[PDB]
Amino acid sequence: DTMKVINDPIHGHIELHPLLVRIIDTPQFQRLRYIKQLGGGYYVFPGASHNRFEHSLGVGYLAGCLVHALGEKQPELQISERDVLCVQIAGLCRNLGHGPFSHMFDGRFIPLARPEVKWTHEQGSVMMFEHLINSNGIKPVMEQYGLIPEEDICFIKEQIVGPLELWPYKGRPENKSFLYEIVSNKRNGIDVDKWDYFARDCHHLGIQNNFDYKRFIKFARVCEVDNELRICARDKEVGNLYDMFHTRNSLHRRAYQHKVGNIIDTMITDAFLKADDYIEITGAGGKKYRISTAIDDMEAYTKLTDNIFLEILYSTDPKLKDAREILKQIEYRNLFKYVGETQPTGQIKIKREDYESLPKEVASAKPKVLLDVKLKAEDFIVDVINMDYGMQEKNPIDHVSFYCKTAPNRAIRITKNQVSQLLPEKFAEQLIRVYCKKVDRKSLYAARQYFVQWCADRNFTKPQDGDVIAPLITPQKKEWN
Amino acid sequence: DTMKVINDPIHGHIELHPLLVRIIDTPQFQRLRYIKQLGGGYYVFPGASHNRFEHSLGVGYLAGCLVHALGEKQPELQISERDVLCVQIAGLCRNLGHGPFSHMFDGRFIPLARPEVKWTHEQGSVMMFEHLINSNGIKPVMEQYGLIPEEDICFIKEQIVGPLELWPYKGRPENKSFLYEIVSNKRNGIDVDKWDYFARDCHHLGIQNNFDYKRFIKFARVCEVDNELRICARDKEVGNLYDMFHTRNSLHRRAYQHKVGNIIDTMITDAFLKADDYIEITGAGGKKYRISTAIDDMEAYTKLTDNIFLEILYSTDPKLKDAREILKQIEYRNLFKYVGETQPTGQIKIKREDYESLPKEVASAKPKVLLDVKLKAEDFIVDVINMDYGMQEKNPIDHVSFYCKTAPNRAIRITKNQVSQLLPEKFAEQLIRVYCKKVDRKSLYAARQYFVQWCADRNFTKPQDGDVIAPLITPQKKEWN
Amino acid sequence: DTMKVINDPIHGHIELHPLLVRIIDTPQFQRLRYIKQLGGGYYVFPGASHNRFEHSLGVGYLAGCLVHALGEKQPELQISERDVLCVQIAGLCRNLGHGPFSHMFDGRFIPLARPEVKWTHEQGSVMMFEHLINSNGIKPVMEQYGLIPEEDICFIKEQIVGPLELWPYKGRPENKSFLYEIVSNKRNGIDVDKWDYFARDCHHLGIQNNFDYKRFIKFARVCEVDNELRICARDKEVGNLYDMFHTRNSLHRRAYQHKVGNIIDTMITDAFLKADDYIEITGAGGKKYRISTAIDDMEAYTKLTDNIFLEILYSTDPKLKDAREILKQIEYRNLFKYVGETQPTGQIKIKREDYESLPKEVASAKPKVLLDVKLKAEDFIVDVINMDYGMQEKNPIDHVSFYCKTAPNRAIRITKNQVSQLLPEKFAEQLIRVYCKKVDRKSLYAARQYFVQWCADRNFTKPQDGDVIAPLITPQKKEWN
Amino acid sequence: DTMKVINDPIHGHIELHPLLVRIIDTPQFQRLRYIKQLGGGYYVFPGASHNRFEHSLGVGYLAGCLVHALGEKQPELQISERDVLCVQIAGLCRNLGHGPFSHMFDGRFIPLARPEVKWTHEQGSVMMFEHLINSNGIKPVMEQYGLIPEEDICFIKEQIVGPLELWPYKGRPENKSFLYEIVSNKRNGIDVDKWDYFARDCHHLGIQNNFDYKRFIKFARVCEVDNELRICARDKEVGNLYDMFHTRNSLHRRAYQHKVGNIIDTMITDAFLKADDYIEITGAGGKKYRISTAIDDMEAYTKLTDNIFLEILYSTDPKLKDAREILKQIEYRNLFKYVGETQPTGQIKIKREDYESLPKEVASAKPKVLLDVKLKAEDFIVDVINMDYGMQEKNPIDHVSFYCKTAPNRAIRITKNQVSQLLPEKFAEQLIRVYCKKVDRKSLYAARQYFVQWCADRNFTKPQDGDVIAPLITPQKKEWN
């Protein structure tokens, strides 16, 4: 068997080693063709038809580019072909755990369907990878190409999910620490997975990408930091690193958190929840699983993709009527109505436990306005979005090591003040979107009054259209004007 | 209510009139989200994840651009807002009739499943459009925005499929004949549908597009030709028009007729044929249809998309085992093996009626090579591809009218010699690909010997790799040496 | 005479009205072919070969696009063909006043050569425009196409330079106030000139542009604000508007203020100053002008372009030896050495009057570190860069009017807190770059010690490489540690 | 000294070895910043501001990419770092010999100014390279980095100009023959110089490029052919190779041979010829040269760039009045008028020696039409363009070697019949453009009559607009009708 070339619109011609091809040509990997990268986003950006499969190829490619570049510049690192292949495989396989409509599944559906369980796509990816290896006789192929399965499978999993539990890794030692910063960077989030989705999502969304990953690679080096060998960026690239996270935030703002994309994701999730008792997925030993329990059996999970949306949509069973009707309303674009957006002021943050109390709060507000209709808690959806630089409150650039041209082997730190006073002073905030399930004109008018009143009662920010949608309410709050 | 803006990666911001939005937001139109533009091509070019839905939006957009531009430059044409809307609707809806995996359905599956019927995507599009209008109460909406449904629905259908049967059209008169040249140009094939797929397919495939549709629009005018008002191009654009068809041929050669893309399409078609007795699709009156008969009932056809592939793949029914196994082999990349390509020589053309006799012919050849295995007719697939400039033998540029700068209202003709001696001497040819269903090394070696011998016996062209794959056969033919 | 089409890499096919063509085809306009958009930037980014001429065409094009879009959406504005042409002409002609190497001339050379005079490219553009009109018999042509020269020439000049001096404009009245916001927006800096250079500079520099001007145009409307009709943006676009200025800042940071591009601009300016007594430029009446005095006579200024660089470089006159030698050193890449960058802290701001005193201060600093060589004020260059959002300390978005979907004719305001807490807290800062004219290793080491000591003495920010370049000095300043 | 990174819009980040930087940072190399790649093309395509300098960097980059890829795939070739550097230097330096406005200088000016001499840019590049090496002490630097100047300078020159005059090369032996196929491919024209200008010219012109050089590199291998090791392409790439030449032809047709770009080049050449007696360029020993004789002294030639255009344009010397006036007319767009285009038929070919007789022939034609004015030989310009695939009549693909997947070390040939029947049947043709120096309406009408009559008299092809421009002449020729 020989290497294969794949033409990708983002990366051009990607060379795949025979071992990589063997891993790719399995039901577990090919499954990713049937899961949309941006889920409900496709229903707002028609270009975003792209799936997790092509993203995965790109991540594997870029992982190879970075590890190869480091090895070529610094032979002293002793990076090996075996190392390169393991990094590529991890890059290739770190999206294996995604479910129907990607983030919607891990972000919205599973938390509601199975609150007791803890689930992440990372854990899913490790489980799927194991299933892929075992179901397709990959281990023999790995030794054929010089890999040592026991150590290297461990190494690959560790790159995906982190320590499987002083040096916490078993797949490689401290001297090769930098290898763990390529595919999924737990230290500061600067990894090749972001680089591919920036470029790929932008290509499909029809929005341009400002981050130059090729430049980053060119300026990347490995230096000793606290007795570890780690990837360091050239000092002058610090502005570009801040911009990388800015680009991520802008993609979330324009696309991933689009108000309508989110509501479509919300509606699809509700449809899945209502279908969950009735859809069956056959797993290992012929046993039957549900959408919510397929995560327990990888054989079942292998067959859990975006297709479930169509299975529900095309169903005739009366048990599926409620779920089916929701999806049909999406098709007719009878969506829940966006009422508005606000943000908390000052120190105050909204806790995850409190999310459920929020619709009730909106319904409880007493706008001093005559209303034809009275709305109830159940008529409102409140979606809270945490926007940050990937490390909650923290500045990820405080967790980057740099080097300077006069001493390329000496790692240094750079503070925010040393860079620009125009940069963010905070690295996390919350957006609160409110929608109404009643779509009639009178209901929407009422919803706007409750919403703006709630904002005022809580001293949230004035909605941008507040003076238009609620001219009677906005005047009462002095701070607003 | 109001117009909507959609951001498209190819065209940027597309404005959709409220009437267009009403048509788009229906089950019949949204269905196109679930049908891949390039079908099996996605399995060779990972970027080609795009669906018929986004292509349809682009076609409607470009149809609007062209009709609008003509009206702005030539007020004397009396192009009306009603005309603009009807052209946009036709552009939007001319892909409604496509089936699962696009060309595979009309090009491969239906011809085999229903040889008696004559089916085209164009006919399908008209039927689906009628179903869309009737199922969603569109006619009242058309009247609201100034359309006259009887005349305008006729006009829209005519743009899609041609005369529904001296001026043959009923939707518009001879003085608006040019309007019929925008969405689906039956005169010479220069239409906005091609312009969108050139740009869109290129963007997703990762191959660059050489044709400038915007330039064409800028140089397009309407002139009187044989007592009809028709779209004419500036004389000087003739080279670019030849190049448009060159671009189309290159896209077919690189992508649409990719040997492996074609074989995947072939395998999927075989799977569908084997599943056809067992898959049920519920149509009007709760009644049940097959993949092959859903075309008879639009309610059933509405639910016939690429999902069928996954329904088969994920099935457990023993009756579907053979169909399911084919799709599973696609996943493992255990595909039928490409043996080679050849072409007829001289005046020889291969008739459609003779396609079935070809595998037998290959199996009947007697290569003077020792073979451990003997292959049979059923082990071979022979795929004949007709590559042309869209009008069989004819030069489409002979069916274009031009105008010159010194007399912009005077239509002229331009012959091929008046342009370049480097242009094609012929405008149609045939490519013949041979594959083998037995994938083992010995079988593939044998298949190569039969194939090259068959080529020699028929006086077809020497396969490009003939001296390598069949060194003992190739020497025999004098014409090849 | 008829309209002309120009193919532009940024905008595609641009249509130019015959009047515009007459203006373009003059020595005064064609001159812009010989002035680089980014001056010394070309010597760092080899792609940035582009000239002011093609930028000007793009600005004229976009000015037309915006005025046309507003008129089509809001017929009630009574925008006239005469208005459209005047806006296009202003867009076309607002770069006429640029001198050799663009910003370098107005930003560096003229302030040093002619400190008494107040010169701006805007003033230059008005003067050149007048010279263009008068020298080429344009006024008759304007009348031919329906313009009224007295009012319209005034209007065009006002768009370029602002009031020529309660409504301050004479070219158009308050009802057409929005027209003044297109070409050069004095209210908030959101104009089509920025939009072209973002796209064009990015195209040539090899840096991606993330601002979508076409989207902005689509969402732009005219609303009444304080008894003026002004351009308003859709409320939703506010994030994108903040990002427009972010993009501008990033282009300055990456490209326009590149440390080496700036030093090359500095060296070229020094060469021009040394050549100024000896280069002659023949103006009106055969009178001779200097590089520094050509601005006084437009006939002379017409012949003052980047050519002057080559005239000096290729000269043999002994008087030009010093100037010529500087340019020759640029060619050998024997440039002054970059020592580092710092910023003021707290309330501290560096005044224009204090710039020379800066080199002396650096030279005056006493490191406490032994040095082989002693450096003098004259050996240092200190370049102070004011980075802001175009309105000094002010937030330009506070000077934008918005509209909301529920009331598109009602102008509103949006504050920064209503948007994101991750946005800049400040909108202006200063960067201080230090270079050394002595390029030897010992001199450079000494320069680094003086520089970091100076930073510490002034309480400026710690240079990013401070611990590497000046390990002895960095510890002393507690604030840094 | 260390490697430098340059950001290029076409290639992104290009790494330059220190030796390459030393060569680049010389007056001889930096000169290329002041010569436009497409000469007069800039005056038709405003995007084409790019210069020979940035093209040269790209060619050096791609030369490195190809040689490095071959070495990585085939260690047995024994490609050395020394080899890589020499190939890069040749790629970098193969444009050193270009003169003002590029092709205009070698293609139009020198043939007229110095008919006795045989001059090519290739010869110029070798001379300039020698001058560069000797003037800047490069040989010691070459030795420092492991080059052997005697052998390697010879090798570099040979790559640029071919054998310096059975293996004809002295710089490398037959086992490294493939190295000579990278920078300037004398065998078939497939070289990295074309690849850069395709991409770069397209980027700037605003026309898309459809040739994928990266793909070509990926599929390139070295195989033994007639006792030489030569670069071979994968068999299936043959279509793409035909398309490479098609792309070249299309760029010539759309851009490089644009009728107006050519006439501007013609006018500039005439201006240079009229200025030649009076412009002085100071060369070695202070001696003076003319535009036409600067090619004799490299020190003078170093200072011969596009600036000559501006020196003439800005001159006041009465002796330069005639030359200056031509350039001023270009600025006013008072260009000679395009009359039309035709081609020879049958076997007819127009020799270089006969070009002079053509204007007289046109003037001699007797159209049987009444004319107000009589035109003379001197009023006509006849421009003959040879359009081919780079090898005159020959098919360059007949001079390409291929390999097949089954036997990657075995070189094969592929004939045109083996490929596509839609490909060109001829590989060379001539275009004849006629212009008139008299631009008045009566003169232009007369010119059209003479032109079409001449075409008929000679049995050339019917001009595309012939029936409009000469309705009384075209009916006469039966072949046309």
Ligand SMILES: Nc1nc2c(ncn2[C@H]2C[C@H](O)[C@@H](COP(=O)(O)OP(=O)(O)OP(=O)(O)O)O2)c(=O)[nH]1
């Ligand atoms: N850019 C470009 N990409 C192509 C072209 N033809 C195919 N591709 C894409 C499709 C695949 O993603 C990738 C590899 O396709 P190939 O046809 O070279 O591989 P295939 O396995 O069919 O051929 P082989 O097994 O090597 O004979 O390149 C082309 O002409 N241009």
Ligand SMILES: Nc1nc2c(ncn2[C@H]2C[C@H](O)[C@@H](COP(=O)(O)OP(=O)(O)OP(=O)(O)O)O2)c(=O)[nH]1
């Ligand atoms: N280029 C670009 N496209 C965007 C941005 N935000 C949204 N889009 C895309 C998504 C859709 O295809 C299209 C329209 O999205 P909008 O958010 O403007 O429409 P939506 O109906 O959500 O808002 P509206 O109903 O007007 O309040 O533009 C953006 O910031 N930049």
Ligand SMILES: Nc1nc2c(ncn2[C@H]2C[C@H](O)[C@@H](COP(=O)(O)OP(=O)(O)OP(=O)(O)O)O2)c(=O)[nH]1
């Ligand atoms: N994209 C593209 N641009 C072209 C092509 N040919 C010329 N251009 C560019 C060059 C100019 O910037 C612009 C107009 O060129 P044209 O050749 O159409 O105008 P020209 O005045 O030479 O012809 P005309 O006076 O109309 O007979 O378009 C082409 O084939 N494709």
Ligand SMILES: Nc1nc2c(ncn2[C@H]2C[C@H](O)[C@@H](COP(=O)(O)OP(=O)(O)OP(=O)(O)O)O2)c(=O)[nH]1
């Ligand atoms: N894409 C991109 N290119 C940049 C950026 N900054 C500079 N460049 C370009 C300009 C040059 O062509 C090339 C190298 O610029 P650098 O600033 O990295 O090199 P420089 O020699 O100025 O710094 P050094 O000597 O390494 O301290 O990259 C950036 O932020 N993004």
